């Protein structure tokens, strides 16, 4: 019988952030083909905690040899991890982690440090601005991402720490809205804000909006190398993109499971991923 590694990740469309993590998973599968391993990828609605509970219970009943997954908020993840620990099934957290429920290994960015870093870079662009804006993506009241929330916290800590006088504005766009009207009104109400940032992976939304309205007097800092994000980076609507090597996170998760289960090797638990800064001038050599 083949090895089965259950991979539980957020629902998404092809080409979005999670596409790269999955390609890393598949690359790992082929690499370890001599061991006949198999990745069974299922998804959950990151905005609906019950979706995580139902799908994670399915994973549990599939009795995989190992599991890698993006945790949702703590209290809705606890039952899953407790069950896996009780069944002796090792799990790996990716993207974010739950510190009081340690896994075999964690692969993701130090969210707080990532946010702190982002603030430092943003202040470099808006050195003497009186306000900056944080764009978010919410649905059913939640932000749907521990990392997106924890990054903002680190960000805010840096701001309160180095630029307490700079006013921080927030605009919560709707996940499955029209982002355009939201933006039109935002700029009408706040016509002098020159710089903004988002902690989700869809800064292109704001970028394309500016590109279309011929607005070149506003630049964004965003996350991840989604095709559309990079286009906005090259066009100038986005000043910097922060990457976390999603492919490597996916690959290393499977490799770690293999190392632990197959090779029976010891493995490092905490694996903070880098906080890579990309600009139009260095993106082409970034791999």
**Nearer of residues 88 and 141 to Na ion, judged by Cβ:** 141
**Nearer of residues 96 and 200 to Na ion, judged by Cβ:** 200
Among the residue ranges 5-13, 53-61, 143-151, 235-243, the one whose residues contact Na ion (CB under 5 A): 143-151
Decide which of a second copy, Na ion, none touches 212; Cβ closer than 5 to 8 Å per partner kind: none
Token duo for residue 165: 């006088």
DSSP label at residue 201: S
Distance CA 122, CA 220 (A): 9
Report the site for a second copy in 265-284 (rule: CB under 8 A).
Answer: 272-277, 279, 281-282, 284
Residue 218 Cβ vs a second copy, minimum distance, rounded to whole Å: 17
Say whether residue 217 binds a second copy (CB under 8 A).
no
Among the residue ranges 112-120, 141-149, 182-190, 209-217, the one whose residues contact a second copy (CB under 8 A): 112-120
Say whether residue 10 binds Na ion (CB under 5 A).
no
Residue 140 Cβ vs Na ion, minimum distance, rounded to whole Å: 11
**Binding track over 192-211 against a second copy, x by CB under 8 A:** --------------------
Query: Which residues have C-beta within 8 Å of that of residue 254, sequence separation ≥ 6?
Result: 5, 24, 25, 28, 29, 32, 37, 39, 68
Decide which of Na ion, a second copy, none touches 117; Cβ closer than 5 to 8 Å per partner kind: a second copy
Size of the site for a second copy (CB under 8 A): 23
Q: CB atoms < 10 A from the CB of 31, how many?
A: 14
Distance CA 52, CA 222 (A): 27
Say whether residue 234 binds a second copy (CB under 8 A).
no
Say whether residue 113 binds a second copy (CB under 8 A).
yes
42 backbone dihedrals φ, ψ, rounded to 5°: -120, 165
End-to-end C-alpha distance for the chain, whole angstroms: 36
Sequential DSSP letters for 49-73 = HHHHHHHHHHHHHH--SEEEE---S
Query: Which residues have C-beta within 8 Å of that of residue 233, sequence separation ≥ 6?
Result: 239, 240, 241, 278, 279, 280, 283
Chain residues that interact with a second copy, rule: CB under 8 A? 109-110, 113, 116-117, 120-121, 124-125, 127, 272-277, 279, 281-282, 284-287
């Amino acid at each position: 019988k083949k090895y089965t590694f259950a991979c539980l990740l957020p629902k998404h469309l092809e080409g979005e952030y999670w596409t790269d993590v999955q390609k890393g998973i598949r690359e790992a599968v082929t690499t370890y083909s001599d061991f006949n391993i198999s990745a069974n990828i299922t998804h959950y609605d990151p905005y609906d905690y019950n979706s995580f509970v139902a799908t994670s219970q399915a994973v549990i009943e599939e009795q995989p040899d190992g599991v890698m997954f993006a945790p949702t908020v703590p209290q809705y993840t606890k039952g899953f991890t407790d069950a896996l620990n009780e069944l002796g099934i090792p799990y790996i957290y990716i993207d974010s982690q739950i510190k009081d429920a340690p896994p075999l290994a964690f692969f993701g960015q130090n969210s707080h440090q990532s946010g702190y870093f982002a603030a430092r870079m943003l202040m470099l662009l808006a050195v003497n601005d009186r306000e900056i804006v944080i764009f978010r993506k919410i649905h059913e009241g939640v932000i749907g991402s521990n990392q997106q929330e924890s990054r903002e916290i680190g960000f805010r800590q840096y701001m309160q720490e180095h630029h307490p006088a700079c006013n921080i504005l927030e605009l919560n766009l709707h996940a499955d809205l029209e982002d355009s009207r939201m933006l039109d009104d935002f700029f009408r109400e706040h016509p002098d804000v020159k710089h903004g940032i988002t902690f989700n992976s869809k800064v292109y939304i704001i970028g394309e909006y500016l590109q279309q309205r011929r607005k070149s007097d506003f630049s964004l800092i965003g996350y991840d190398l989604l095709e559309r994000n990079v286009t906005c980076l090259k066009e100038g609507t986005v000043s910097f993109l922060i990457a976390q090597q999603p492919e490597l996170q996916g690959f290393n998760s499977i490799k770690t499971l293999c190392d632990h289960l197959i090779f029976r090797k010891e493995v490092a638990c905490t694996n903070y991923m880098p906080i890579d800064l990309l600009t139009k001038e260095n993106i082409d050599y970034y791999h």
